[PDB]
């Protein structure tokens, strides 16, 4: 699954 | 008496938090003197999340493309530059609430407080540790990027972390205030995984000393251990190696309690073998590893 | 995502903390408007603390016997009176940093942030719950009395706790900001014991909802239970009775997650009868009861102040 | 022990 930039 | 996961008072950091908007993207910035520091992915759009070329995205922006809001006051941006993974926005007014401060890069196992913010306003404050795999187990939602982690010493705020992103396992990653990531992470929405995490041994030992200071000795035993044999056992439980530097750092707590560090190591070996068998230590049923030796001394001695 | 024991931002309260010294005794005070509030035992000496007559100790004191320091500025005391177990010291300087505030008295199970202070200087911030036995499990040393607990509701700081003392068991006791003790305790250095504590059931359920929001569902099950049947199991494990009002307060979390309150009760029941089987919930091997339903919402929805 | 006034 992908990283989420917050 | 008592022992709590205690954060630093957040007031000095609250007075530095602002909101930065580029396009439809909003996150937090840190306003110190006449510069606002923020994560560079504020300039990303939905097409720029997997393989952004930040140099190319930034050259397409003018100063007036950055909207900086401090409370209900707009700050005029008069210059911008990129330093690693952070933007530095020069503004035409110095923050009158700027505390005395330093930028520091911390080591895995060190703790700090986080002021979680959204749209430049604070939500709350909690205490964090830099894990051995350079992630942090925070509490962060979309829009929290640019929230900072920090320690306070006397009157000086040492900023050590700026939040950027969340890994698929639910842990968090960010940079120091010079924009260098902790760990082998990058500000891209690709699949990224941290190294296997481990338990911060020197912190667990500090916390056991805290329990003794607070009047509890049930977990001690009559044994000692060599440092070698302690590390051979502890590694089997996914604990970090204990070094002679760590032993020296535990000196003050050892001297305060009369318990040699290697004798506390023997206690920990038995706790790992046995578990707690229905008992608790300082209110926990797990061995806690997010207090440093300094944190213990700070809290059991009332440093302000 | 993530779930942490999260305190309110403390800046509004930091600006209110002062040092109060009377004779050889020093503790903290809360400076709002032109009044400093502090525990009445600041007028005690070490020989006065077994059975102090506070009325007589205070008659012997004049305004000049109280030294109030705000940072390094001395505030001149121009009046003094006692309200229950607190002193009110009128000073010559209104606090320019007084926030919008009110004094509230909380009930057992409610949580608050503590700003631990020594010599009028904030030391740290942490979350606390008022236990069912009216104690708090704080972290307090000598000199910490006069530290306060608070909640924030948007624009308004609600002060609910002033710290006074430590019981022999290591837990803590204090008053509301009008000087009324929480729990059956008195401010003197005698042996005093709190009632056997119990677990705050409504908060455990809130924390289970927090776990669901954070992707922990392994404890959810297909069983059901009635309110009365759950309570019969809860009391056996020293849990507070769940009331309908508690069921109602859990509405928003229940609607957010799509889990009926009684279904969360069925999950908790099985956790109480069988344990976690070596597993954890939100990084914990114990069932946590110091998050209220509103604490969960404010954290998981990013409410700001 | 006895209560400690802090």
Author numbering:
A (entry chain F), D (entry chain E): -6 to -1
B (entry chain B): 1 to 304
C (entry chain A): 1 to 305
What wording appears in the published article?
Six additional cocrystal structures of Mpro bound to the product (cleaved N-terminal side of the substrate peptide) were also determined and comparatively analyzed. Our cocrystal structures captured the N-terminal product after the cleavage reaction was complete where no covalent bond exists with the catalytic cysteine. The N-terminal products carboxyl terminus is coordinated by the catalytic dyad. All 6 cleaved substrates bound at the N-terminal side of the active site superimposed very well, defining a “product envelope”. There were no major rearrangements or shifts in the backbone and except minor side chain conformers, the products bound similarly to the noncleaved substrates. Overall, the product envelope recapitulated the consensus volume revealed by the substrate envelope for the N-terminal part of the Mpro active site.
The SARS-CoV-2 translates its genome into polyproteins that must be cleaved to release individual proteins essential for replication of the virus. Given that Mpro processes the majority of these sites, any intervention that stops this process, such as an inhibitor, would block viral growth. The crystal structures of inactive SARS-CoV-2 Mpro, with the catalytic Cys145 mutated to Ala, with 9 substrate and 6 product complexes were determined to sub-2.5 Å resolution. As in previous apo and inhibitor-bound crystal structures, Mpro crystallized as a homodimer.
